[PDB]
Write a protein that binds this ligand. Structure first.
Ligand SMILES: CCCCCCCC(=O)OC[C@H](COP(=O)(O)O[C@@H]1[C@H](O)[C@H](O)[C@@H](OP(=O)(O)O)[C@H](OP(=O)(O)O)[C@H]1O)OC(=O)CCCCCCC
Ligand SMILES: CCCCCCCC(=O)OC[C@H](COP(=O)(O)O[C@@H]1[C@H](O)[C@H](O)[C@@H](OP(=O)(O)O)[C@H](OP(=O)(O)O)[C@H]1O)OC(=O)CCCCCCC
Ligand SMILES: *[C@@H]1O[C@H](CO)[C@@H](O[C@@H]2O[C@H](CO)[C@@H](O)[C@H](O)[C@H]2NC(C)=O)[C@H](O)[C@H]1NC(C)=O
Ligand SMILES: CC(C)CCC[C@@H](C)[C@H]1CC[C@H]2[C@@H]3CC=C4C[C@@H](O)CC[C@]4(C)[C@H]3CC[C@]12C
Lengths: 804, 39, 333, 44, 51
């Protein structure tokens, strides 16, 4: 290799004395010196067009001192100016000024902080450095690399490049000096002998940047072919030939308004061929749903895809938006946990109640947030899971078989099933669940959520109907046995007020009022503010009764006489049948199908490419974790939990920030779900806080969640585009390339599917819903093409909302 | 080619040739007053 | 099922038919009261032509606030029942994917820059393109109608004029480039006319000529400087300098060029015009039929001159239209 | 003259890559950060 | 407009031609008149409102 130094003639700031300060150094890679006094980063040298023009023009008429018999900077300057005057490059009256210039103190980076910095200058006739007259340009390298020595071989010989400005000059001059014997000079502090000297002097001109000129000369000297030619050069003509071959193999990159990495990468063969031609004449030589067919390959690939991002998964949560999302998702996961809890409790002999579901929702959420590949999912108990459990309790009560133990065996088979599917990458089939099925499932589940939210209000209106006459002394423990005045109306008022406040704060988030900081802060905390406002509203009305949240007394079992925190696989009271130890497979198959479909479709909906998710989602790892914790919790009479769609979608929405209408990024982190699970577990401890929160406030929150979950649903948009004259239709691919009646027929087919699913849900055969949903995967691919064209299906059913 | 061209696009025709009877290279730059479909 | 792909305004052939070829072969310049033809291209084939014809309407607007009361906005359907003497449109030729539509304008239409807009039943307004409407000396019902084709050529289509200067007994013809069909003269003339806020009156050549004459006289008084300085290259550089302030100014020894500039503006807008020179013109009298000349005993004149002098010559703009607001018999020059 | 002034401005924003023995991908991708700043004011 | 960041204020003559703080001061003097009239309404001399 080689070491090259570039020094500019500059003035100091304290004594206003012009001097030589080194500006950049080359060991193949160029390092630049900033104004602070440290060295910028090491980078490949890039030259400007004008610098190379200037170097070529001044080298064509340059002054070469080859095999020069000297070892001193002063005498080399003497001989160089002698050959300058002999070649009429400078007038003989200028020899005094240039020799004075070439032999000042050559300062380095070690004394930059000792002095007051360096400023550009021009040596004038009087020897006074005046201020340059031409417009100044701060260094591009001092703005890109300098804003923030052991590699030198022992046998290498250094090169020193001196560039300076002197008004006393007709034209820029170049003197290239090679010594016969490499010698150390006082200009260079590094213990490397100097072989070549570049001196570039002249007057301020158009298009002549002397820093860029010195950079070009130093880059040319750092080039291996030019260096080898210069060591063996016996004339200026050979150096000019080497410079001509250097410019022949240079790549000029013209400006463009579309800077791209791929367009620049298309120039690889040009760069390789130019390098080949430069070294040809030289003596030297140039120096996520993929089936991997590998067992557990998908699981391992999910691990390598998500776990490298683990550090950001904690640091990215340091924002108040994350805290507001935690407050939102805490209630959004706690209230369904409590509600369903007492249902199973009231329907399963308190064998499985709130206590078991709070602990299972807490433990599974903690470990899924800490281990899962998609932390934004919320693990909780779903309606299909309440219905299957009632299906099992009914069968076992019919056949004398026990409950808790069968569910202990169902989970044991569930673990085997999930290990089997992860082993053979069974979660790859989730590549056939196109946007058709995803949107159908999401819209149906949102409609179910809204229907249940309104049905709870209908139920509380039924429990306390509006009457002319009431009984003023009605027992309140455990719940009011008779109707009470002002209860249903106040509950409706609270629910409507919570929904209205949440929607108004959602509008205020995107609104135009208040400082943009406070507004957004206030905007993310919309749901917590609505809950607080309505809770204080109800708390200040002491007389009227409203149903509050109810949490268990402690972390014990709901029925201390039915089971313990664990369950013997072979029986608690009687010998459990051995056929049930094998019969548990088919209902385990059904439960696995339910959990698999729910979790995979939820992950697909949340991790859509249009929602700006750049961290990846692991189908195999998430399915394995969810079903495994379900099976393990079954070993303790604890419930099986799945990634529900509404809670996970709400979690993703609450962690999504909006740009100037446009999704910008999602706060992909593990802290929010972990804290939600911790709070769900601790909800038993904080009973005084939860006992003053009405259920109507949470009903309004549920209505808000169900309404806002329909944002990204294109099926909802196509529902709306059925009641909008075919003119206000937005400019989207499925509108501009599909006939309006064709799009309406497609939407009506999806409506037929939705109606079939909704009818199936309201029937006793509500466990068939996963199977009838996988009868849309057939249609989207098999039939559909029989009545539609390729472009029509590409526009209507798109993977990332693209126009094919 | 035609699909990638924006609708309000105009053409630039760069004519390059070698003539040994010319003393020096010559550059001719023409801007038409309005865009024309030359036959 | 009536989506529009593109609209070909057919600028070259329509401009040839409307005697506006020297203006452009790419921008549509049409003279009022004469049909011009556009081609409408559909994205998909039109199955049934008659219901599609019932579903489409065309709209023409001029100015910044078009209204039906100002006659600056017009909405007409595409049918053979359209009024050919008013705004109308009719399909002369068609195939599955295109309609060849002949559009007419009234002979008394407001001139200026226009937008043609398509309205397809149950859809939003679609801009078809822009065209500029001018006066029509070739149309018998227009106010600027000229009987002779030779006179039409001479007073509207010829950009090579002659301004006669000198004395009565020694008339020297100076070649003049009116240049009314230069690419910016029409835009400059319409921009100058836009300083008049009675856009409803822009259908009247008398009002337009009066407004432009007053404005050009004001510009001549503002921009002509007191005394190469006498080198001239026609009316167009003078108009550019008067309207924008950039270019070589005109000095007071050549103030007669106002007539040529007015002739250029009138000719570009479609009003036939010629430059007329009167030798020995008594100017500055205010209607008085007496001129006082004062000479000393040497037969010479002392001062700078009287207010009422007999000029050696004076140029003036003549223009051709009818005079509807005047009594019978004053049509012509 | 205006065309010449535009051409000199175009050359003022043109970047030359000399023959450098680094691998082609890194040598070319090092121009991205530099073309970016050298075109910060040109297209403003 | 007293509660909206200035970068959103509409393109209207009274915003473009008047400084933002001047416009807010004018709105404040009108608010002072409004408060005075409201105080006058809630007094036994509420018939002095039109004066
Ligand atoms: C209560 C908060 C403070 C009270 C005292 C009020 C004093 C106070 O804090 O200044 C307010 C502020 C003045 O600062 P200014 O408007 O210049 O600051 C702009 C404002 O913050 C915008 O919201 C920002 O855009 P965005 O929206 O983030 O996209 C914009 O960022 P950028 O994009 O331009 O770089 C900022 O430049 O303007 C208001 O919000 C007016 C409503 C204040 C009335 C509030 C009275 C209740
Ligand atoms: C209960 C009422 C009847 C419902 C069933 C009605 C069933 C039925 O008749 O459908 C066909 C009919 C076609 O109407 P079509 O789109 O041709 O008519 C356009 C429509 O009326 C727009 O609202 C008008 O906009 P605006 O007022 O000028 O701003 C537009 O004005 P313009 O272009 O003429 O200037 C009208 O041309 O309506 C539909 O639009 C379909 C979806 C309608 C909604 C479907 C149901 C919500
Ligand atoms: C806890 O479980 C026990 C037995 O599983 C329940 O006791 C039964 O209650 C039902 C309801 O009347 C009846 O079958 C008998 O009274 C009890 N059966 C037996 C075998 O004891 C008890 O009710 C459960 N406790 C709670 C709170 O659910
Ligand atoms: C998928 C997992 C659960 C394995 C499938 C279950 C079957 C194959 C195995 C698992 C545990 C086994 C039991 C383990 C221990 C006993 C007690 C012994 O005195 C009789 C056999 C009996 C009762 C076994 C029967 C078969 C059995 C139930």
């Amino acid at each position: 290799k080689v070491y090259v130094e570039l020094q500019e003639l500059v003035m100091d700031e304290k004594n206003q004395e012009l001097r030589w300060m080194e500006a950049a150094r080359w060991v193949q890679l160029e390092e630049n010196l900033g104004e602070n006094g440290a060295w910028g980063r090491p980078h490949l040298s890039h030259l400007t067009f004008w610098s190379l023009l200037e170097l070529r023009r001044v080298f064509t008429k340059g002054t070469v001192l080859l095999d020069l018999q000297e070892t001193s900077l002063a005498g080399v300057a003497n001989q160089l100016l002698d050959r300058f005057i002999f070649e009429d490059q400078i007038r003989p009256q200028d020899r005094e000024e240039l020799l004075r210039a070439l032999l000042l103190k050559h300062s380095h980076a070690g004394e930059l902080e000792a002095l007051g910095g360096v400023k550009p200058a021009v040596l004038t006739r009087s020897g006074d450095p005046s201020q340059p007259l031409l417009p100044q340009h701060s260094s591009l390298e001092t703005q890109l690399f300098c804003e923030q020595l052991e590699k030198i071989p022992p046998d290498s010989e250094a090169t020193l490049v001196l560039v300076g400005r002197a008004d006393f000059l007709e034209q820029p001059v170049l003197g290239f000096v090679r010594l016969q014997e490499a010698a150390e000079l006082e200009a260079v502090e590094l213990p490397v002998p100097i072989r070549f000297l570049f001196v570039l002097l002249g007057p301020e001109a158009p298009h002549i940047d002397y820093t860029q000129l010195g950079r070009a000369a130093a880059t040319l000297m750092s080039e291996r072919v030019f260096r080898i030619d210069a060591y063996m050069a016996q004339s200026r003509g050979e150096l000019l030939h080497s410079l001509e071959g250097f410019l022949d193999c240079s790549l000029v990159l013209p400006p463009t308004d579309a800077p791209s990495e791929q367009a620049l990468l298309s120039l690889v063969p040009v760069q390789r061929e130019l390098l080949r031609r430069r070294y040809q004449s030289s003596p030297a030589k140039p120096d996520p749903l993929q089936q991997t067919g590998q067992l557990f390959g998908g699981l391992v690939r999910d691990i390598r895809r998500r776990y490298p991002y683990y550090l950001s998964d904690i640091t990215d949560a340091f924002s108040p938006q994350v805290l507001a999302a935690v407050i939102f998702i805490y209630f959004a996961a706690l209230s369904p946990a409590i509600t369903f809890g007492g249902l199973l409790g009231e329907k399963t002999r308190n064998q499985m109640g709130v206590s078991e579901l709070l602990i299972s929702t807490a433990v599974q959420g903690i470990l899924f947030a800490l281990l899962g590949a998609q932390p934004l999912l919320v693990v909780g108990f779903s309606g299909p899971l309440l219905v299957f459990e009632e299906a099992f309790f009914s069968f076992c009560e019919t056949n004398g078989l026990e409950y808790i133990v069968g569910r202990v065996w169902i989970g044991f088979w569930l673990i085997l099933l999930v290990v089997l599917v992860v082993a053979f990458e069974g979660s790859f089939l989730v590549r056939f669940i196109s946007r058709y099925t995803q949107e159908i499932f999401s819209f149906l589940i949102s409609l179910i959520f809204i229907y249940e939210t309104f049905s709870k209000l209908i139920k509380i209106f039924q429990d306390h109907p509006l009457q002319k006459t009431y009984n003023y002394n009605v027992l309140m423990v455990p719940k009011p046995q008779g109707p009470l005045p002002n209860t249903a109306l106040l509950s409706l008022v609270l629910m409507a007020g919570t929904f209205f406040f949440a929607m108004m704060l959602r509008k205020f988030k995107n609104s135009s009022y208040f400082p943009g900081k406070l507004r957004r802060v206030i905007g993310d905390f919309g749901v917590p503010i609505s809950i607080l406002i309505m809770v204080l509203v109800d708390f200040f009305i002491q007389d009227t009764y409203t149903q509050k949240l109810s949490v268990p007394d402690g972390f014990k079992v709901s029925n201390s006489s039915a089971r313990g925190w664990v369950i013997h696989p072979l029986g608690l009271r009687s010998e459990f049948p051995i056929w049930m130890m094998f019969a548990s497979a088919l209902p385990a198959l059904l439960v696995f199908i339910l959990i698999f479909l729910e979790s995979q479709i939820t992950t697909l909906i949340v991790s859509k490419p249009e929602r700006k998710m750049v961290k990846g989602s692991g189908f195999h790892l998430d399915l394995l974790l969810v079903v495994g914790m379900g099976g393990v919790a079954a070993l303790f009479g604890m419930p099986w939990l799945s990634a529900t769609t509404v809670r996970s979608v709400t979690h993703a929405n609450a962690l999504t920030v909006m740009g100037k209408a446009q999704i910008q990024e999602v706060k992909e982190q593990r802290i929010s779900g972990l804290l939600v699970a911790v709070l769900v577990g601790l909800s038993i401890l904080m009973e005084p806080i939860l006992s003053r929160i009405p259920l109507a406030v949470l009903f309004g929150i549920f209505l808000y969640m169900g309404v806002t979950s329909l944002s990204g649903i294109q099926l909802f948009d196509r529902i709306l585009l059925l009641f909008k004259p075919p003119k206000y239709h937005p400019d989207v691919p499925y509108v501009k390339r599909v006939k309006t009646w064709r799009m309406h027929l497609f939407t009506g087919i999806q409506i037929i599917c939705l109606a079939v699913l909704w009818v199936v849900k309201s029937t006793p055969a509500s466990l068939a819903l996963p199977f009838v949903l996988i009868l849309t995967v057939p249609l989207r691919r098999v039939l559909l093409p029989l009545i539609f064209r390729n472009v029509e299906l590409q526009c209507l059913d798109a993977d990332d909302a693209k126009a094919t | 080619i035609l699909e990638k061209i924006p609708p309000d696009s105009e053409a630039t025709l760069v004519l390059v040739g070698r003539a040994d009877f010319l003393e020096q290279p010559v550059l001719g730059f023409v801007r038409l007053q309005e865009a024309a479909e030359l036959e | 099922a009536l989506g529009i792909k593109s609209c070909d305004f057919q600028a070259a052939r329509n401009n040839e038919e409307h005697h506006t070829k020297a203006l452009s072969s790419r921008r549509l310049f049409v003279r009022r009261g004469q049909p011009f033809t556009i081609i409408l291209y559909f994205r998909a084939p039109v199955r049934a032509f008659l219901p599609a014809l019932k579903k489409v309407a065309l709209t023409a607007q001029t100015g910044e606030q078009p209204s039906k009361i100002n006659r600056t906005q017009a909405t007409f359907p595409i049918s053979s029942l359209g009024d050919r003497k008013w705004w109308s449109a009719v399909v002369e030729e068609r195939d599955a994917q295109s309609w060849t539509i002949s559009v007419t304008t009234p002979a008394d239409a407001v001139i200026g820059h226009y937008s043609l807009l398509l309205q397809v039943s149950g859809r939003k307004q679609l801009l078809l393109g822009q065209f500029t409407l001018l006066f029509n000396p070739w149309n018998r019902e227009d106010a600027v109608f000229l009987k002779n084709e030779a006179q039409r050529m001479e007073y509207l289509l010829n950009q090579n004029g002659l301004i006669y200067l000198g004395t009565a007994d020694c008339i020297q013809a100076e070649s003049w480039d009116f240049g009314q069909f230069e690419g910016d003269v029409i835009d400059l003339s319409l921009r100058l006319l836009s300083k008049d806020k009675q856009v409803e009156k822009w259908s009247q050549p008398v009002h337009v000529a009066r407004v432009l004459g007053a404005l050009l006289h004001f510009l001549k008084e503002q921009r002509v400087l007191p005394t190469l300085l006498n080198k001239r290259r026609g009316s167009v550089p003078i108009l550019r300098q008067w309207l924008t302030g950039r270019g070589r100014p005109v000095y007071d020894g050549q103030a007669w060029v106002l007539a040529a500039v007015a002739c250029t503006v009138l000719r570009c807008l479609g009003i036939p015009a010629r430059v007329v020179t009167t030798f020995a013109s008594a100017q500055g009298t205010g209607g008085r039929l007496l001129i006082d000349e004062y000479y000393n005993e040497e037969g010479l004149q002392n001062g700078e001159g009287q207010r009422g002098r007999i000029w050696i010559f004076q140029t003036s703009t003549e223009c051709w239209m009818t005079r509807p607001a005047l009594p019978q018999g004053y049509d012509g020059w």
